[PDB]
Structures are given as structure tokens and as C-alpha cells.
Design a protein around this nucleic acid. Structure first.
Ligand SMILES: [Zn+2]
Ligand SMILES: [Zn+2]
Ligand SMILES: [Zn+2]
Lengths: 176, 85, 95, 214, 140, 101
RNA sequence: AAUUAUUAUUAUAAAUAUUAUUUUAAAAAUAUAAAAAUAUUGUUAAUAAAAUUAUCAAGUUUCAAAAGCGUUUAUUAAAU
């Protein structure tokens, strides 16, 4: 069934199993509390959690500081699909000093293809109400021309538009 | 039973205008222009349900507290009238 | 073409960060050029490296109201009109 | 609204008459049954601009004003557009919810005072400005002999030296007597017509002109 | 709400259409992005993610305000996963980074959260109709 | 149905939405929104952008028949021709925006 | 899926379009139940896990027998 390795990004909803469990939605907000609360849950993402084992050896101490993110240029150069031997971070760089550039993996390009089709969707909605706030906005503006031209006509032709009776049934301010 | 960009109103909706129920377009009096209203809460029904009293659904515990502020404590102004003309 | 450099998208986002550093010290402010916190390990400040073909949903935002966009850097095409415009930043100091 | 039906006799409020409504006399035997007193679905009053533009120009004159004697002021303006004490109160509910007026019980006393709210206070100051800007056009004295009232320019300026608060006291009853003569020889008759907006809320569009009878 | 207990809704966990006639609950005029600080369109739009954290007052007259694209973690610069953020000194920080953790790239959408716009995702909680004693009802 | 005989006709076409006659491009000029784009908002997104969609077969237009010439899907439905400038400009990612080297 | 059929193919994203396929003058069964006094299990192999509700849709308690929470083609002291 369309192996997940085919989808550009692994699918959002992940269907499972469980003959005796019927619910489409994956229970997020539980996969979130664990992970945020427990540091260990997610593999260290080697670099940000290496660089110890390289400070301890060369400095005789625990690093005792926040490790830099964004692995140094030159690390994980033989790896090809890092994405796990890292966080989902990109393959760091060459061992260069050139400005950081995303190595346009098939994945990064897809994200570009989202943040353009997100701006696309929010733009096709943003200007429906912009023209919807002309149609109804100008329909009212015109409808009040109607009640005005009806307002003018209904005085010379004297149609009080309040029943068969004269205003003497109105002046009582009863039902009648 | 409908509010505003900054204000409120009240209206009982029929079946015919069920489309405009969620969010309307109306003359916001705390302004001078038509402005889109919302549906802050229910205030009853437009007709009877079969075999039921006049107030079948009942307005709310909520839309009543909105009413008890509009009509409610008018004790600032039984002056200039109470109900007479 | 004579000298009009084929500017990849990475460049026209590297020439934006340079131009945004110029406008700052053209506004008189301190030109905190982004790539002068950039060292051999990446951002010396221990921050997540800002990768240059920057997404259009992560545009570098400075809360000082500096405008740099594609309309800005497209005329800075050839080699010469940057070595004089961004002279002060691309050139290292040897004193 | 008739004399003896909902209200006691002689309470023919001397305010803007409704147009075409014949005021007929009811015998002084009248009384509803103990249940018809209450059915009596009245006619809804305009609360739109022209009353809410007119009421506030009152409450802008008499900035702190005891609610009780408020109605005795709107009667005084030549441009009273208000049918009766009921219409005022409904407009006064409107202008209350708009945020224009704000009743506060006058702590030293036991009566409320329609205070023009400071939120929309700078709006009515402009609003009273346009009407006065557009009202002084009509008068036949403003333009025929402007110097007859040029005697007023200096006086009132030097009046505000010694007795400004006592000057207008007599001026207040003076106009109250001169606006009544007008209100015998012309009133703002209100001709209204219902209309249904696109949302099915039947309401009335109004307008007002001055009927000349002499 | 007040809703003493055993009277709140049960299956969806929250009542639809929080009526708020007591206080009108409108977007203010002196409104601005918490993360970005640029003024926010008044109300004509749903480009802003208006998180009214129940009664907030402190972030703004009402609760925090963010344009949909300023709703990222400030420190790590990616999306706020599961939308729980951590207001670090007036710049919304991602809870995991704001908590000290370091795993700093998500899978699905990096620089834009999954959030709803204009409180439409925040109206599952907070200030239902009886927000107080509100006994003016049955009293005389 | 004021027909007296219902059919593919005398089915009153819009017994609602009485606020007809919208001048889109004229209104689109007030909003400054690329007149070719705005008109696309008001037809099923199949018809304008490169999206998966379902077409009726008569809509597709027939081969040159003995009775009628080849009636292409365009020359009978001009305002339904997809505009692939407007697609690409909006929906697809350009080589330019990710050119890194 | 034999079809223009039960049928949102949910990879994504978005949130106010006045987007547009459903015959018709009756009572039986039946699918079905709005409404409505008493009665509360006397029905039955056995009532009570048995649609929705703005009247906001939830039985409480005791005893005896009974492990793990996963997993199964006649679905459980099955097999883990
Ligand atoms: Zn308003
Ligand atoms: Zn923002
Ligand atoms: Zn973060």
C-alpha cells in the first residue's frame, strides 16, 4: 500500500491496526508530552550530542555548556541519508567556510513546494472575502438605492404600505 | 445573538436565511457602515416545534443574561418613561 | 555576456544580507552583518545555522524595519558594482 | 399614540407630531380590560441617525444633566425630531449601547446624569459642529443684517466676564418661549415607511420635514 | 467558566459558541504581533493567530497576537510543534528549546505551524458563557 | 418551475442569489489583483490550475462529426481554458527560487 | 468495486461563493417512530453497553466467579 518511502514527506496520519480499536486520528498530544518532557526519548542526534566525547577527551571536563546546533562543517561527510544520524538536520556541509547552503535534497525542495502552495492557498482565500466584501458590500449599497427609490415613489403614490386601513388605526399604537 | 467588529444586536433567524446565520453583513451602529456580524449565541426559534409550548427551545441561560443587561437594570431611566407613551 | 555574473538564488540571498548590513550603517545603526558571526563551526553564537536559499516562510526579520528584496540586488549583477558597494564588508582587515 | 388610550388625557406631548396620524378624542369613560391593557403592541420608534444626531447635540449642550428634566430640553430645540417621551427613552437606550451616553447616579443626589462618555466624546464635538455649521445657514437674520447680532458678539464675550451663568438663564426661558411660537406654526412631521433588509428584519426608513400651517 | 461541575459538556469536552455578552471579546486597536511586533490588521482578516489565553490582559488588552507566519519558535526558528509555546521574554519560544532540549528540526512543516487562525483553534477552551457567579439571572 | 412541463428547461436557474451581474475584472481592478487571477477564483479550481478534476464528456467536445465540425473543448468554453502562466506563477516552484551553487 | 453505483481515494493545504440533479393528493403491513396519563420487568432465553435532543442523553450499591491489557476466521480461562 504505497510504501511510505515513496511519499516526499512521510504521511501525516499514520493508520495502524487493532481490529478492536476504531479511530482514524493518531493520538498526538501524547507523542508530544513524552519527547518534550523526557530528553532521552529521541536519539541524541549524534553531533549535538557528540562534541562531547570530544570535549571530555581534549579538555578533561564535561562540556557543561549548551552544545552548538547545526553540526560543524566537515562532520558526517561519508553519510548519505543522515536524517537519523543527526536530527532531521541537513548533511552539514563540506569542510569549507562558504556560507551555509541547504544541500537541495529531494526533501528540501518539497518543503519549498509547500511554502509556495501554502502562500497559494492563503491567497486564494484572502481575496475571496476581498471580492465577497464587494458583492455583498455593494449589493447593500445598491439595495439602499432601491429602498430610496421605493421610498420616494411610495410618497407621491401615497401607498402607505401599512394595510387596508388609514393611519387612524396606526395612531392608536395598539394592534388596532 | 449577533455581534460585530465591536458591537452587538439581536435577531431571530428563520429557515430561509439559514445561510447567513453564522456570519452576517449588517449596519454596525457603533460605526456608520455595514460590518460583518457573528453568531455569539442562540435566542430561541422562529416558530413552534410540534406539540410544544411557545418557548420550546428556550432562549438560553446566556442570551438571557444579555437581555438582563439591556432591559434588566434600566433603573437609570424609568424616567422619561416606563412602558407608557 | 560581458561581466554580468550568473547570480544563483543563494547569491541573491547572500547579496541581500550584505545589502541589509549596508542599509543599517547607512541608517547609522550598527551593521550586524549576519556572516560575521559565521566561523569554522558555523554560527559562533551557538545558534542554528541560517541556510541561505532561505524559505519564503522564514524570511530573515530584523525588528528595525530594513527592507531588502529581489528588486534590490538584481542591479548588483557584475563583479565591479559590489566591490565598491559592499567594499567595507567583503574585504577583510589586515591592520 | 392617542390622548386617552394608553395615556391619561391632556398628555398631548407638544413635540414632533407624526405625519397623517389624526389625533381624535376618546370619551372620558375609556379603560381597557385587565388584559387588553397589556396586549397593545406599540409601533416601533426610529432610533437612527437623526434622533441620535439630535439627542447628542442636546446632551452636548447640557453636558451633565439630570435624566428627569432631560426631556424638557429636547422640546426646546427648534429641530426637535422626537415624537414623545417614549421615543426619547428608546433613543436613549440606543445612544447608551452605542457608548455615547453613560448614566451615573449623581452621588450627592439620587438621580442619574446622562454623562457623554469620554470614549466617543470627541466625536460628538465634531458632530455638533457640522449641524450648527449647517443650521445657521437657514435663519433669515444670519445674512440680512449680520450687524444686529454683532451687538451679541461683544456682549457675550464681556458677558462671560461677570454673569455668564446668569445671562443664559434668562436666555434659556427666552428661547423656550420663542421656540414654542414656532412649534405652533411649524412642526417636524415624521413620515415613515417600512422596508425589509436582505436579512429579513422588517424595519422602518424615516425622514422628517417641517409642516407649515400658521 | 463557573458551570459548577457535571454541567459542562461531556463528549466534545466543550460547548460550541462561547457566548460572551458580558465582555464583548473583540480584537483591540493597539494590537501587535508578540513574536514579530509589527501592527496587526484590525479584524478584516484571519492572517493573525489570536490566542486569547482565557482572560489574558497582560500580553495585550486581550491575549497574545501573532501573524500566521510569525507563529514560529523564536530561538530555534522552526514551527511550534503541537502548538504549545513558551512566552520567553515577549518572544514566543518553542517549548522544547525553551525548555533546554535540543532536537531542532521537525518532519512535516518546518517554518510554519499547523495552527488555526483568529482564535478558531483556541475556542476549544476558555471562558464559556457563565464566567463568574452571574446570578443576576434568577435574582429579582 | 413555471413550466407546466418540467424538463431541461423552465427549471428556474437561480431561485436565489438575486445579486447578479458581477463585473469581476472591473472589481478586480479596485483590489489590484491581476484580473486574470480573480476570475479564476469563481470557477471550479479544476478549470484554471493544473489540478486533478472531473470533466463531463460533452464538455470535452466531439470529433468532427458529419453533422458538426470538430468542436474543441476551448472554442466552445473559452473561459475554461486553463491558464498555465497563472498556474506556474502561483502553484509550482521555480528553478530560480532554489538555485544554489 | 461488472455501472455514471454504497463511494469525500485525506499526499497535502485552506476557512463567509446565496459553486447547485431527485417524481407525486390516501389507509395495510413494514423501514420506522414525533407525541403522550398510569404501571416498572407480570413481558422474555434473558429489561438496563444500546441513534440523535439544548428538556445538553451518565444508573447507584453488595456478593460470588475471573487474568491482563496485547492478540486471533465461527473470538474466548484461544494463543502471546
Ligand atoms: Zn461595530
Ligand atoms: Zn506576526
Ligand atoms: Zn525552538
Amino acid at each position: 500500500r504505497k510504501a511510505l518511502q515513496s511519499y516526499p514527506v512521510p504521511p501525516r496520519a499514520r493508520n495502524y491496526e487493532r481490529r478492536w480499536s476504531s479511530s482514524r486520528t493518531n493520538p498526538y498530544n501524547r507523542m508530544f508530552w513524552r519527547t518534550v518532557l523526557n530528553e532521552d526519548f529521541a536519539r541524541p542526534s549524534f553531533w549535538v550530542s557528540d562534541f562531547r566525547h570530544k570535549y571530555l577527551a581534549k579538555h578533561g571536563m564535561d562540556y557543561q555548556g549548551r552544545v552548538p546546533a547545526s553540526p560543524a562543517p566537515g562532520m558526517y561527510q561519508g553519510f548519505s541519508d543522515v536524517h537519523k544520524i543527526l536530527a532531521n538536520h541537513p548533511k552539514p556541509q563540506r569542510e569549507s567556510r562558504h556560507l551555509p547552503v541547504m544541500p537541495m535534497t529531494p526533501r528540501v525542495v518539497f518543503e519549498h513546494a509547500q511554502e509556495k502552495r501554502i502562500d497559494y492557498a492563503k491567497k486564494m482565500h484572502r481575496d475571496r472575502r476581498l471580492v465577497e466584501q464587494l458583492r455583498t458590500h455593494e449589493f447593500w449599497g445598491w439595495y439602499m438605492k432601491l429602498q430610496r427609490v421605493r421610498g420616494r415613489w411610495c410618497k407621491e403614490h401615497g401607498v402607505s404600505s401599512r394595510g387596508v386601513y388609514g393611519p387612524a388605526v396606526d395612531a392608536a399604537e395598539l394592534w388596532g | 445573538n449577533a455581534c460585530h467588529v465591536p458591537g452587538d444586536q439581536i435577531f431571530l433567524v428563520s429557515n430561509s436565511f439559514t445561510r447567513r446565520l453564522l456570519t452576517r453583513t449588517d449596519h454596525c451602529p457603533k460605526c456608520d457602515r455595514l460590518s460583518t456580524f457573528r453568531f455569539m449565541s442562540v435566542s430561541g426559534m422562529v416558530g413552534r416545534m410540534p406539540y410544544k409550548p411557545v418557548d420550546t427551545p428556550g432562549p438560553s441561560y446566556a442570551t438571557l443574561y444579555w437581555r438582563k443587561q439591556r432591559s434588566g437594570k434600566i433603573a437609570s431611566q424609568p424616567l422619561n418613561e416606563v412602558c407608557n407613551k | 555576456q560581458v561581466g554580468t555574473l550568473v547570480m544563483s538564488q543563494a547569491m541573491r540571498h547572500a547579496l541581500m544580507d550584505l545589502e541589509r548590513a549596508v542599509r543599517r550603517k547607512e541608517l547609522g545603526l550598527e551593521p550586524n552583518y549576519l556572516w560575521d558571526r559565521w566561523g569554522p563551526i558555523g554560527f559562533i553564537d551557538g545558534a542554528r545555522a541560517d541556510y541561505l536559499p532561505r524559505f519564503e516562510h522564514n524570511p530573515y526579520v530584523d525588528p528595525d524595519g530594513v527592507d531588502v528584496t529581489e528588486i534590490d540586488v538584481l542591479p548588483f549583477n557584475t563583479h565591479e558594482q559590489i566591490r565598491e558597494r559592499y567594499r567595507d564588508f567583503i574585504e577583510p582587515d589586515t591592520a | 399614540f392617542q390622548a386617552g388610550v394608553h395615556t391619561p388625557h391632556g398628555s398631548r406631548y407638544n413635540a414632533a407630531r407624526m405625519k397623517n396620524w389624526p389625533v381624535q378624542e376618546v370619551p372620558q369613560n375609556f379603560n381597557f380590560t385587565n388584559e387588553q391593557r397589556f396586549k397593545a403592541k406599540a409601533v416601533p420608534r426610529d432610533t437612527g441617525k437623526i434622533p441620535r444626531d439630535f439627542l447628542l447635540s442636546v446632551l452636548y449642550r447640557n453636558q451633565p444633566c439630570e435624566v428627569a428634566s432631560l426631556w424638557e430640553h429636547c422640546l426646546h430645540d427648534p429641530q426637535i425630531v422626537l415624537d414623545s417621551k417614549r421615543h426619547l427613552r428608546e433613543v436613549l437606550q440606543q445612544a447608551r449601547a452605542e457608548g455615547f451616553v453613560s448614566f451615573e447616579k449623581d452621588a450627592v443626589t439620587d438621580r442619574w446624569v446622562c454623562h457623554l462618555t469620554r470614549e466617543r466624546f470627541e466625536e460628538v464635538r465634531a458632530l455638533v459642529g457640522a449641524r450648527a455649521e449647517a443650521q445657521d445657514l437657514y435663519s433669515g437674520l444670519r445674512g440680512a443684517s449680520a450687524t444686529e447680532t454683532s451687538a451679541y458678539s461683544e456682549s457675550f464675550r464681556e458677558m462671560n466676564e461677570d454673569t455668564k451663568r446668569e445671562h443664559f438663564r434668562l436666555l434659556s426661558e427666552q428661547v423656550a418661549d420663542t421656540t414654542t411660537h414656532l412649534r405652533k406654526f411649524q412642526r417636524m412631521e415624521m413620515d415613515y415607511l417600512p422596508y425589509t433588509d436582505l436579512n429579513g428584519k422588517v424595519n422602518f426608513m424615516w425622514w422628517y420635514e417641517m409642516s407649515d400651517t400658521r | 467558566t463557573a458551570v459548577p461541575h457535571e454541567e459542562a459538556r461531556s463528549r466534545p469536552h466543550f460547548p460550541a459558541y462561547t457566548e460572551d455578552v458580558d465582555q464583548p471579546m473583540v480584537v483591540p486597536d493597539g494590537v501587535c504581533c508578540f513574536n514579530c511586533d509589527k501592527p496587526i490588521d484590525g479584524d478584516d482578516i484571519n492572517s493573525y493567530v489570536w490566542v486569547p489565553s482565557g482572560n489574558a490582559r497582560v500580553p495585550t488588552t486581550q491575549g497574545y497576537f501573532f501573524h500566521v507566519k510569525c507563529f514560529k519558535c523564536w530561538n530555534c526558528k522552526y514551527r511550534i510543534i503541537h502548538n504549545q509555546f513558551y512566552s520567553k521574554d515577549s518572544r514566543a519560544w518553542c517549548l522544547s528549546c525553551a525548555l533546554g532540549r535540543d532536537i531542532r528540526v521537525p518532519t512535516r512543516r518546518w517554518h510554519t505551524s499547523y495552527v488555526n487562525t483568529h482564535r478558531t483553534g483556541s475556542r476549544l477552551t476558555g471562558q464559556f458563557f457563565p464566567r463568574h457567579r452571574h446570578q443576576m439571572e434568577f435574582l429579582f | 418551475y413555471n413550466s407546466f412541463e418540467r424538463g431541461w428547461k423552465d427549471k428556474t436557474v437561480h431561485p436565489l442569489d438575486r445579486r447578479g451581474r458581477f463585473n469581476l475584472d472591473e472589481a478586480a481592478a479596485e483590489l489590484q489583483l491581476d484580473e486574470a487571477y480573480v476570475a479564476s477564483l469563481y470557477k471550479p479550481l479544476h478549470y484554471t490550475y493544473s489540478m486533478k478534476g472531473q470533466r463531463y464528456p460533452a464538455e470535452q467536445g466531439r470529433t468532427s462529426r458529419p453533422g458538426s465540425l470538430a468542436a474543441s473543448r476551448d472554442r466552445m468554453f473559452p473561459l475554461y481554458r486553463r491558464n498555465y502562466k497563472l498556474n506556474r506563477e502561483l502553484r509550482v516552484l521555480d528553478h530560480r527560487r532554489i538555485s544554489t551553487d
